[PDB]
Amino acid sequence: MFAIDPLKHSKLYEEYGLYLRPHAPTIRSIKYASLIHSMLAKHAARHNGTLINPRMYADMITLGNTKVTVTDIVTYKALTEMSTLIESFRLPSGLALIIFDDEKYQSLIPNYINQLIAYTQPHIIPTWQGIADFSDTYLRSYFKRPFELTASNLAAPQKYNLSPMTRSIFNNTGREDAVIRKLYGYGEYVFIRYEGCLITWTGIYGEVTMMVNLSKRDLGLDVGDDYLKEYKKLLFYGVITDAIPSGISARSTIMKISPHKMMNPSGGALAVLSKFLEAVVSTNVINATLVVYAEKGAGKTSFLSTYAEQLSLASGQVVGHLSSDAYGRWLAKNKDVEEPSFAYDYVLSLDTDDNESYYEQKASELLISHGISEVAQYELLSVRKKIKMMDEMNEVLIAQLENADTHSERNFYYMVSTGKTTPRTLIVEGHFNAQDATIARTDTTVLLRTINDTTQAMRDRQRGGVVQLFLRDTYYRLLPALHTTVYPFEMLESIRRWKWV
Amino acid sequence: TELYNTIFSETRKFTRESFKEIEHLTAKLANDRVARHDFLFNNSIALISDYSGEDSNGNQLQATVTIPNEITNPKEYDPSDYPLAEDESFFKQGHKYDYLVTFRAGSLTNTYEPKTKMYKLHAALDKLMHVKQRKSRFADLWRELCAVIASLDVWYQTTNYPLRTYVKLLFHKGDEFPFYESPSQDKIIFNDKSVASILPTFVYTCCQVGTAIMSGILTHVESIVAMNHFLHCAKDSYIDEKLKIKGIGRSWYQEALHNVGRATVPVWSQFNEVIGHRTKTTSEPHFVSSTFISLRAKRAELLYPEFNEYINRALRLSKTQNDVANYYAACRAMTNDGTFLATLTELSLDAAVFPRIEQRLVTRPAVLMSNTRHESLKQKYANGVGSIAQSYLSSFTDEIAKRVNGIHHDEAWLNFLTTSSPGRKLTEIEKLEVGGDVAAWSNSRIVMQAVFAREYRTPERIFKSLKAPIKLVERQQSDRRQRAISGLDNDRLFLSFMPYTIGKQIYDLNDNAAQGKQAGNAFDIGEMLYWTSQRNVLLSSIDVAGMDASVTTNTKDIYNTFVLDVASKCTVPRFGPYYAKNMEVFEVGKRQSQVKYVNAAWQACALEAANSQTSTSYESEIFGQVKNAEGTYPSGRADTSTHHTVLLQGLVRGNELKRASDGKNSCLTTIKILGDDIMEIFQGNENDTHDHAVSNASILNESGFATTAELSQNSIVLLQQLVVNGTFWGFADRISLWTREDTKDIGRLNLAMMELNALIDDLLFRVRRPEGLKMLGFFCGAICLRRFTLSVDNKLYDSTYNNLSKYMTLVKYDKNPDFDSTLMSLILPLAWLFMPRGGEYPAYPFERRDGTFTEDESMFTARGAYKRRLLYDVSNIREMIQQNSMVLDDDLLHEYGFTGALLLIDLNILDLIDEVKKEDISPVKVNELATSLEQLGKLGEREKSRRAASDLKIRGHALSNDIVYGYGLQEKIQKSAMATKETTVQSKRVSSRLHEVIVAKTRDYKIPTMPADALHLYEFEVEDVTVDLLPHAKHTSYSNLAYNMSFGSDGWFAFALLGGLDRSANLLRLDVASIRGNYHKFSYDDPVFKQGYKIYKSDATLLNDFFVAISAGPKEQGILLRAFAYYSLYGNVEYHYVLSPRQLFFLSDNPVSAERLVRIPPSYYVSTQCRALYNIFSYLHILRSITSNQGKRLGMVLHPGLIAYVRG
RNA sequence: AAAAAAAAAAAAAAUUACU
RNA sequence: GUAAUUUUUUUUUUUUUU
Ligand SMILES: [Mg+2]
Ligand SMILES: [Mg+2]
Ligand SMILES: [Mg+2]
């Protein structure tokens, strides 16, 4: 007994590559569970959406060891009804409740089924990369079993004992399903449809897998291509499924590409991101601000500028975007000026990459007082020697966060957000969690992850690669994942799911 | 004709003419305002300017009345005193004034077009002056001022005191009042617009300053210094200047105590007993004498120069410790206005709830086990303060993890929801689905859980809450800021329930968490009283300045590391919508993903710790929706107090292990922590104790907390309770008799008197004159609450009046307002104040027919059914037993007015009102709602405990539903459905039913009697033998241990006779209090104890069903049985009485301590219950008649009918 | 019949205290 | 010394312009 009835939502299982076997003891069992679902939903609707004895229900269905019979009568009327149905099945045991290990699947389970799970031992089928393992006991008996066709495997369906009633086809030959179906005689077989990609690269430490939310045709990449080619599509739609740090870098090439199941955005992400879209749309809010935290070197500026245009076009309003280096580049110029300017157009013009930050000048002279001038001297230090230097860099950061003075960080973001000519919608980037008390007064702060080894993009760069790697470690030590984590493909998905006007 | 010329003002007794005179003169002050204006502003009061008298310690002082010009001639309203940001989205960043500025009342005009920013700013600034200032506890503010001035007149028999001229020089502007408050508009109307905007509050300041004079804290000349200091702060802005000098005008006492040099002080045992007295030195160490320099300079320039010379005088004229204690009590009355400090919540927002970043930034711990989304499942600290805290805390993670396994967390969450608190607002689409009555009750957490019970196990329920905002809600408090709080919805409050359940278990494995002020008596300060009696000890009462805002996002991770450690070692399936399952997981060192078995407690705590949004949101009338910055701990949560407690005790106790691993010793004996209050006690060498205290403060700075170190040799503070050398200094100004915070004056009748009785009780052991506190409260009940107004239907208006007029005087209003009913006031007799089920206030000597008087009842006089004895006492019990009659003398009780008073009690008006409100509650909806909540926890044990109650009720014993655990769900939904205000159709049913009972009772009303009233017929005779005093009477004659316990006083003598607290009784009370959740204070008068003890004596073999009905597990069954066994040594069921723990603060709870003072003939012991009964008769008499107790032995006499009632 | 302004009568939603 | 106040709808009359 699956948690979602496959006879009703058969298109939902086809997303996972699960096609129902045609129309046996297993054919009889999937029809029985479909009658139990209809009975349970009819019983739940009669008391405010709840089952009155979720433990008796769970024991009758999943253990099959309870009988209720009339020989009070109104309190056990629903349990007497479910009892005679299950008696008519004459099963040797009870129907086990089956769940997937997917977040999308769990979001679609009915409410009355969720009330049973507390009083059952469910059978949870794991998923590797969003796809449940087809070798499971229940998945093998109820659905068709996939057969993966590759390039070293392409032959007629006769070379193997394949039947169209027990096998589905996963075309991984790189060729069209129409050529495979006609030039090789798979006309009577059902092909599974995957819309994403699953790329495997070469990493510094090994091989890295990445899931992308684009089709293999839309994403113009083949085996052997480069990481920098089509980089913005990977960054906008890709999520690396390895442990951090992965070894991905600008020297990676593709070893294998395959169609894969397309990823679902997280629920906690779409909730906090749509909490920001409420403020953008509402008229009871004057200033709206989304704070975005990320690691140094993630490529968040390249993305959050495109996210800001897609939000301005959909909302119809002007959206401002301060970089994470906005205050430090301003402070480098106006640290001695007694009455500096806080105009949005002045701050925006200092936010270019050719302006040096105030924090980069202090960490540069700090690394010299210890004798560090190259990346190789820094990577040779022990952990305790590095941490002892970050504690001195923490003294330079605390001095700009401690008060609200003219050149403080809190006053900067106050005079910029509350300015007359500043856009009503702002997107501010941050570096560490302590800037919570200084950056604009908001209700929505997120942490952005990309497909980027941040320590690898910092040591494989120019323009002061040792200060950039040192500040990346200093900020990392101040930025846990205590705010909601989002991906670039989830932040774009929230704009599309919102109903504008 | 005048209150100070009455004969009650010269005798302080109630004769048949003194009582009728004071009755008519006080009712004249409560009814019409022409008499009040005449009383306050009579021309016979000659204004005085120069005054001279004695200060609080008997030295001479001279003062002059001074009223600044900014109050008599205020300035024009300056719109630059409340600026805005250039975007006008909020107030300016650093703005000087958060409270009401002093300007001319009519100077604030709103000449802007509506629906505009400057119009909204002025429509709100108008509400700051007209609405946020009316905060009165009992009645109108001019009635409350009349009550304070009446008592100051009757006590001093004169009118020439400095407070009368302040009242006349401040509020006498014309022939009417400068302002009044209309209860209809809920607003203050100004009659004189040329007046200061701040004056409506100064009516309360006069009430508070006159309250301190009646209390013995201030003298008449010190009332000038106090009123001159308050008016000096009101020159620019009253509240802004008071908060700025609050601490500087108080922290001088440690220097004054140093200059005293020597002090003879009491010495406390470890078991709550005074065992001796010693002379010690009050000299502070060298590191404390260094702070005297900086504090001298601050007082010299920030303080009102007339107030500063009082402190310099207090600091040089003090010779004993009792001198510093008296001067210090006065400077609290001079710096605390007494009111509750209220303003616009937009103006106090940034100073109360904005995050702040102190000395150092807190860094992250290394993540060891992670998620598929890289959200920490397990972490560890490499170094820093997180490593220091976990070195102590990680040694409790295994014992806590097993205590968590033995809890049903779904049933625990249903009992945590005993709150009828809002959460959020229902949706019309959602509202339509439930329909009607149910949505009218949805301002409760238990009802919002019942409506949405279908999705309790649905995981999407959690993500939908991250989309809802956290509604900000603020509270008021005397002498502090507004301090907005967060109100979470049932779903975000759920994510904080497992972190709360885990960190709550550590309270059972240590002794460094203060239980709080649970006991209510001197048992709360028992540790301080002991440790301040030792030598070579350093006392540290350290305070974290704004801890709630100082907790940053990374500081919260130190508690996350503790909670995630416990959650990973437990085995909890099925917590909420979570279940234990195999989970894909990342690990450190390993390059690919692993698979682990994660339980439900781990999934809940891991999701909560990685989705943290602490910013609250307030919907403002000026600016729309206002949001805070991120970082401030929400402080409305389940684990808001267990977080601060666990984090602080892990830093203090972990720094103890850090110093030991460095080769340094620790001098730390105990620490007591509750929230952000810390109390450290070091004993040892002077440099050893200072070394340990400095590193303790430095580790708190390393955690991003700012704090001030007030170290002392001879004083310590914890939870607003100051102990100085084995002596308790009470804070009497922290209690406002005249102001309140909630705009709901609950207690429309007979429950406001319970509120005044509970407020007077809190003031006894923190006041220098409890007999002047009795005259005050008597006039508060005679003037402020003596009218009862209700609306009566016009077809029954004349019938209720004509029938009620025979017992009490009634007031009627306009004939035709063109409505169905008109409102009708009710003026209750003064005798109602001293009657049971009525006022229940301590009485004055009433005169009997033979010419003798009753007792002058003290502040230790018991309440409850014991007040019924006054009916027989004025009837001369002594003459009553001589004739062997049990009769009331109904003629005399009618002259004083007891017959009319007792009749009004028999109407049971408040009970009558709540019956018509419950008739509109449909039990079909309450039962359907309760049915759906039962499918969420434990699947049973509501029906089982309900049946145990009914199978109990079929026999003699019937428990009340609030006791029975099976009706726990209903009793809240009744409260949720009764929280609604009374409608107009219900006021008719009230009037109709009230009219029926009046024509039923008033036919021939005689004071009724029960057979059990024969227990009241007992008296006492004074012998010629002087009883001996307890040895701890010599130990308390030097440096009394309370303000009301000075040598020779009545509170001192009651200690020398009865003794101190019962240590074995208070220990059994602290146990029965820890069995009840959402339970602040337990008393032996509580329903569960009284109902359970009644069956334990009657039918003990039915006590198991009682335990099933209340759902008492084997731990609580032993805690209750252990207390039933001890209470039966001295308890009694038949003779009920009520004493409060705040009332007998130092005094004994056990009646048996009074049996050494009274002689009883052995022929009177005719029954098994006689001994405990007679011990009560004498225990209650010695506390009531303590003012005339010269130390002689008593002899008990008994009525022949009392002996007959006891025999059987 | 197109609109604006006010008077009467009825309906709609509507003030809020966390642990 | 009461039962009112925000915004929205419908019908009822008043006056102004086509
Ligand atoms: Mg403290
Ligand atoms: Mg504090
Ligand atoms: Mg505190």
Short mmCIF file of C-alpha atoms in Angstrom, two decimals, chain B residues 692-999:
data_model
loop_
_atom_site.label_atom_id
_atom_site.label_comp_id
_atom_site.label_asym_id
_atom_site.label_seq_id
_atom_site.Cartn_x
_atom_site.Cartn_y
_atom_site.Cartn_z
CA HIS B 692 38.79 34.31 39.76
CA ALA B 693 36.13 37.02 39.45
CA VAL B 694 38.07 38.98 36.82
CA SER B 695 38.57 35.95 34.58
CA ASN B 696 34.87 35.16 34.93
CA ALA B 697 34.00 38.63 33.65
CA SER B 698 36.58 38.37 30.88
CA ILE B 699 35.10 35.12 29.57
CA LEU B 700 31.71 36.84 29.39
CA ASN B 701 33.19 39.67 27.34
CA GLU B 702 34.81 37.10 25.04
CA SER B 703 31.28 35.84 24.35
CA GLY B 704 30.02 39.19 23.10
CA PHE B 705 28.29 40.25 26.32
CA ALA B 706 28.80 43.61 27.99
CA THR B 707 28.53 43.58 31.76
CA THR B 708 29.24 45.71 34.81
CA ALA B 709 31.01 44.09 37.76
CA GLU B 710 29.47 45.10 41.08
CA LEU B 711 31.62 43.20 43.54
CA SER B 712 30.88 43.47 47.23
CA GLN B 713 32.07 42.13 50.55
CA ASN B 714 28.71 42.55 52.25
CA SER B 715 25.82 42.75 49.77
CA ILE B 716 24.31 40.58 47.03
CA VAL B 717 21.31 40.84 44.68
CA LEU B 718 19.33 38.20 42.79
CA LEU B 719 15.89 38.57 41.19
CA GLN B 720 15.31 42.02 42.71
CA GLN B 721 16.03 40.79 46.24
CA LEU B 722 18.83 42.57 48.09
CA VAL B 723 20.51 40.84 51.04
CA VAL B 724 23.07 42.81 53.07
CA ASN B 725 24.94 41.01 55.88
CA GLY B 726 22.20 38.59 56.81
CA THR B 727 19.49 41.23 56.43
CA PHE B 728 16.81 41.69 53.76
CA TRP B 729 16.27 45.12 52.17
CA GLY B 730 12.91 45.23 50.44
CA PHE B 731 12.10 47.25 47.34
CA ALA B 732 8.78 48.87 48.24
CA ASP B 733 8.64 51.18 45.21
CA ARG B 734 8.58 48.21 42.83
CA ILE B 735 4.91 47.75 43.80
CA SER B 736 2.39 50.19 42.35
CA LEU B 737 -0.93 50.37 44.18
CA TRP B 738 -2.24 53.07 41.85
CA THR B 739 -1.13 52.11 38.31
CA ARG B 740 -1.39 49.01 36.14
CA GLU B 741 -0.15 47.89 32.73
CA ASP B 742 -3.08 46.06 31.16
CA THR B 743 -5.98 48.09 29.78
CA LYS B 744 -8.38 45.58 31.32
CA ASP B 745 -9.31 46.45 34.91
CA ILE B 746 -10.17 42.84 35.73
CA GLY B 747 -11.97 42.32 39.01
CA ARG B 748 -15.12 44.37 38.54
CA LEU B 749 -16.12 43.56 42.14
CA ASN B 750 -14.77 41.54 45.06
CA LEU B 751 -11.85 40.53 42.84
CA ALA B 752 -10.30 43.98 42.80
CA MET B 753 -10.26 43.73 46.58
CA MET B 754 -8.35 40.47 46.21
CA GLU B 755 -5.92 42.40 44.01
CA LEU B 756 -5.49 45.11 46.64
CA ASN B 757 -5.12 42.50 49.38
CA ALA B 758 -2.43 40.75 47.34
CA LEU B 759 -0.63 44.06 46.78
CA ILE B 760 -0.66 45.04 50.46
CA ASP B 761 0.69 41.60 51.38
CA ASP B 762 3.69 42.06 49.09
CA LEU B 763 4.50 45.33 50.89
CA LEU B 764 4.64 44.25 54.55
CA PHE B 765 8.22 42.96 54.86
CA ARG B 766 9.54 45.74 52.64
CA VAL B 767 8.04 48.70 54.54
CA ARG B 768 8.96 50.57 57.71
CA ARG B 769 5.39 51.07 58.99
CA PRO B 770 2.77 48.42 58.18
CA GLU B 771 0.15 50.15 60.33
CA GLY B 772 0.22 53.21 58.09
CA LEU B 773 -0.14 50.77 55.22
CA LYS B 774 -3.45 49.65 56.73
CA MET B 775 -4.93 53.14 56.91
CA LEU B 776 -3.93 53.64 53.27
CA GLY B 777 -5.62 50.51 51.95
CA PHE B 778 -8.72 51.16 54.04
CA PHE B 779 -9.27 54.51 52.33
CA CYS B 780 -8.50 52.96 48.95
CA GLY B 781 -11.35 50.50 49.47
CA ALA B 782 -13.61 53.23 50.85
CA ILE B 783 -13.16 55.80 48.06
CA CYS B 784 -11.70 54.14 44.97
CA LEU B 785 -13.86 51.00 44.89
CA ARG B 786 -17.20 51.63 46.60
CA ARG B 787 -19.52 51.93 43.58
CA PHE B 788 -20.75 49.07 41.39
CA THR B 789 -22.28 50.24 38.11
CA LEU B 790 -24.35 47.96 35.88
CA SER B 791 -27.09 48.45 33.29
CA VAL B 792 -30.65 47.50 34.28
CA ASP B 793 -33.63 47.04 31.99
CA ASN B 794 -36.18 49.85 32.23
CA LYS B 795 -39.11 47.51 32.92
CA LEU B 796 -37.28 46.30 36.05
CA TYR B 797 -35.46 49.54 36.93
CA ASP B 798 -37.88 50.67 39.64
CA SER B 799 -38.36 47.16 41.03
CA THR B 800 -34.67 46.53 41.72
CA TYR B 801 -34.23 50.00 43.21
CA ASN B 802 -37.21 49.87 45.56
CA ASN B 803 -36.25 46.38 46.75
CA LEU B 804 -32.52 47.06 47.23
CA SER B 805 -32.89 50.47 48.88
CA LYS B 806 -33.81 48.86 52.21
CA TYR B 807 -30.26 47.56 52.79
CA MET B 808 -27.94 49.86 50.87
CA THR B 809 -27.97 53.20 49.08
CA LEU B 810 -28.32 53.15 45.31
CA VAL B 811 -27.67 55.71 42.59
CA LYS B 812 -29.68 56.08 39.38
CA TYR B 813 -29.01 57.86 36.10
CA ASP B 814 -30.93 59.51 33.25
CA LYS B 815 -34.43 58.25 32.58
CA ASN B 816 -34.42 57.95 28.78
CA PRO B 817 -31.23 57.67 26.72
CA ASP B 818 -33.58 56.39 24.00
CA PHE B 819 -32.45 52.78 24.53
CA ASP B 820 -33.79 49.63 26.17
CA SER B 821 -31.87 49.76 29.46
CA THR B 822 -30.19 52.41 31.59
CA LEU B 823 -27.19 52.02 33.86
CA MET B 824 -27.51 52.04 37.64
CA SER B 825 -24.73 52.39 40.19
CA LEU B 826 -24.60 50.50 43.49
CA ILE B 827 -23.01 51.96 46.63
CA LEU B 828 -21.95 49.22 49.02
CA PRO B 829 -21.61 49.78 52.78
CA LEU B 830 -18.26 50.19 54.48
CA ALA B 831 -18.89 47.00 56.48
CA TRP B 832 -18.55 45.09 53.20
CA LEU B 833 -14.78 45.63 53.38
CA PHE B 834 -14.29 43.48 56.49
CA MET B 835 -16.69 40.67 55.59
CA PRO B 836 -15.92 37.19 54.24
CA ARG B 837 -16.56 36.55 50.56
CA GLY B 838 -16.48 40.34 50.39
CA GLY B 839 -13.67 42.79 51.04
CA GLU B 840 -11.86 40.64 53.64
CA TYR B 841 -9.81 43.55 54.91
CA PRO B 842 -8.21 43.95 58.35
CA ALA B 843 -10.57 45.82 60.64
CA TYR B 844 -10.31 48.61 63.19
CA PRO B 845 -11.65 48.26 66.75
CA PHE B 846 -15.43 48.05 66.60
CA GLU B 847 -17.28 48.88 69.80
CA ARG B 848 -19.40 46.29 71.57
CA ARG B 849 -22.61 47.05 73.42
CA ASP B 850 -20.99 46.77 76.86
CA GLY B 851 -18.54 49.49 75.89
CA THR B 852 -15.44 47.46 75.11
CA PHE B 853 -13.77 47.18 71.71
CA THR B 854 -12.71 44.33 69.48
CA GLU B 855 -9.13 43.76 68.41
CA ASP B 856 -7.15 46.07 66.16
CA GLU B 857 -6.50 43.51 63.45
CA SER B 858 -2.95 43.51 62.10
CA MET B 859 -1.39 42.73 58.74
CA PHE B 860 -0.85 39.11 59.80
CA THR B 861 -4.59 38.58 60.28
CA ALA B 862 -5.86 35.52 58.45
CA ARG B 863 -8.54 35.65 55.75
CA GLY B 864 -11.07 33.19 54.40
CA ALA B 865 -13.72 31.70 56.67
CA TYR B 866 -11.84 33.21 59.63
CA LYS B 867 -13.20 36.70 58.92
CA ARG B 868 -16.64 35.30 59.79
CA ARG B 869 -15.59 35.42 63.46
CA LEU B 870 -15.86 39.22 63.55
CA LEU B 871 -19.65 38.83 63.52
CA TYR B 872 -19.57 37.05 66.89
CA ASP B 873 -16.66 39.09 68.21
CA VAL B 874 -18.61 42.35 68.16
CA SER B 875 -21.41 40.34 69.79
CA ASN B 876 -19.15 39.69 72.82
CA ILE B 877 -18.22 36.02 72.58
CA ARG B 878 -16.98 36.38 76.16
CA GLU B 879 -20.47 37.30 77.39
CA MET B 880 -21.85 34.73 74.96
CA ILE B 881 -20.22 31.69 76.58
CA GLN B 882 -21.20 32.94 80.04
CA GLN B 883 -24.90 32.73 79.13
CA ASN B 884 -24.49 29.55 77.02
CA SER B 885 -26.20 31.00 73.97
CA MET B 886 -25.23 31.13 70.30
CA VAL B 887 -26.93 34.29 69.04
CA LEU B 888 -25.70 37.14 66.88
CA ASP B 889 -27.16 40.32 68.42
CA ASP B 890 -28.73 41.15 65.08
CA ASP B 891 -29.69 44.64 66.23
CA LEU B 892 -26.11 45.83 66.68
CA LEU B 893 -24.89 44.22 63.46
CA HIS B 894 -27.57 46.24 61.67
CA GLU B 895 -26.46 49.61 63.06
CA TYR B 896 -22.94 49.19 61.67
CA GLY B 897 -24.41 47.87 58.43
CA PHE B 898 -23.28 44.26 58.42
CA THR B 899 -26.78 43.11 57.46
CA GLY B 900 -26.76 45.11 54.24
CA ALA B 901 -23.17 44.07 53.56
CA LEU B 902 -23.78 40.35 54.00
CA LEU B 903 -26.91 40.52 51.83
CA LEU B 904 -25.01 41.98 48.86
CA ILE B 905 -22.59 39.06 49.16
CA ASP B 906 -25.56 36.67 49.00
CA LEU B 907 -26.61 37.99 45.59
CA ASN B 908 -23.44 36.46 44.08
CA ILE B 909 -23.48 38.93 41.23
CA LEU B 910 -20.22 37.94 39.54
CA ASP B 911 -21.09 34.25 39.69
CA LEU B 912 -24.53 35.16 38.32
CA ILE B 913 -22.96 37.02 35.38
CA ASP B 914 -20.77 34.12 34.26
CA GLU B 915 -23.73 31.74 34.12
CA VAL B 916 -25.42 33.70 31.33
CA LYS B 917 -22.12 33.72 29.42
CA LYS B 918 -21.69 29.93 29.51
CA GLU B 919 -25.24 29.39 28.25
CA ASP B 920 -24.07 30.64 24.84
CA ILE B 921 -21.25 28.08 24.67
CA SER B 922 -22.42 25.16 22.56
CA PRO B 923 -21.08 21.95 24.16
CA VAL B 924 -21.45 20.19 20.80
CA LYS B 925 -18.66 22.37 19.42
CA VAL B 926 -16.49 22.09 22.54
CA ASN B 927 -16.77 18.31 22.43
CA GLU B 928 -16.07 18.06 18.70
CA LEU B 929 -13.05 20.32 19.18
CA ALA B 930 -11.86 18.27 22.14
CA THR B 931 -12.31 15.03 20.22
CA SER B 932 -9.87 16.13 17.51
CA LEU B 933 -7.22 17.18 20.04
CA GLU B 934 -7.29 13.72 21.62
CA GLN B 935 -6.07 12.13 18.37
CA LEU B 936 -2.74 13.93 18.82
CA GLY B 937 -1.36 12.63 22.10
CA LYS B 938 -1.22 9.24 23.80
CA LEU B 939 -4.47 7.92 22.27
CA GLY B 940 -6.39 7.70 25.52
CA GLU B 941 -5.75 8.77 29.14
CA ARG B 942 -8.33 11.52 28.75
CA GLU B 943 -11.30 9.16 28.80
CA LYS B 944 -9.57 7.09 31.48
CA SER B 945 -8.96 10.05 33.79
CA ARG B 946 -12.43 11.40 33.05
CA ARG B 947 -14.03 8.09 34.00
CA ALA B 948 -11.95 7.96 37.18
CA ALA B 949 -13.45 11.36 38.03
CA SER B 950 -17.03 10.22 37.41
CA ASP B 951 -16.62 6.86 39.15
CA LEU B 952 -15.33 9.04 41.98
CA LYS B 953 -18.23 11.50 41.81
CA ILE B 954 -20.79 8.71 42.16
CA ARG B 955 -19.51 8.40 45.74
CA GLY B 956 -19.24 11.17 48.31
CA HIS B 957 -16.22 12.82 46.71
CA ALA B 958 -16.56 15.03 43.62
CA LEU B 959 -13.55 16.80 42.14
CA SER B 960 -13.70 20.11 40.32
CA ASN B 961 -13.15 19.92 36.57
CA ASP B 962 -10.07 22.15 36.56
CA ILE B 963 -8.44 19.51 38.75
CA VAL B 964 -9.50 16.57 36.57
CA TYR B 965 -7.02 16.02 33.75
CA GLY B 966 -9.63 14.66 31.34
CA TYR B 967 -11.44 18.02 31.25
CA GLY B 968 -8.17 19.86 30.73
CA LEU B 969 -8.97 20.41 27.07
CA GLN B 970 -12.51 21.66 27.71
CA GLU B 971 -11.76 24.07 30.56
CA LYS B 972 -9.49 26.03 28.22
CA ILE B 973 -12.01 26.11 25.36
CA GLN B 974 -14.51 27.40 27.90
CA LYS B 975 -12.05 30.15 28.85
CA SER B 976 -11.38 30.71 25.15
CA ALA B 977 -15.12 31.02 24.50
CA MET B 978 -15.67 33.13 27.62
CA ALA B 979 -12.84 35.58 26.91
CA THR B 980 -15.35 37.52 24.82
CA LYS B 981 -16.92 40.62 26.36
CA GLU B 982 -20.56 40.66 27.42
CA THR B 983 -23.04 41.55 24.69
CA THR B 984 -26.16 43.70 24.94
CA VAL B 985 -28.59 40.78 24.72
CA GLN B 986 -26.75 39.17 27.63
CA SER B 987 -27.00 42.28 29.81
CA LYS B 988 -30.78 41.81 29.75
CA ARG B 989 -30.54 38.21 30.95
CA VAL B 990 -28.21 39.40 33.70
CA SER B 991 -30.68 42.10 34.70
CA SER B 992 -33.58 39.66 34.49
CA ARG B 993 -31.92 37.01 36.66
CA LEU B 994 -30.51 39.55 39.11
CA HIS B 995 -34.01 40.98 39.55
CA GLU B 996 -35.38 37.55 40.44
CA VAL B 997 -32.90 36.97 43.26
CA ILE B 998 -33.46 40.39 44.84
CA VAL B 999 -37.20 39.90 45.33
#
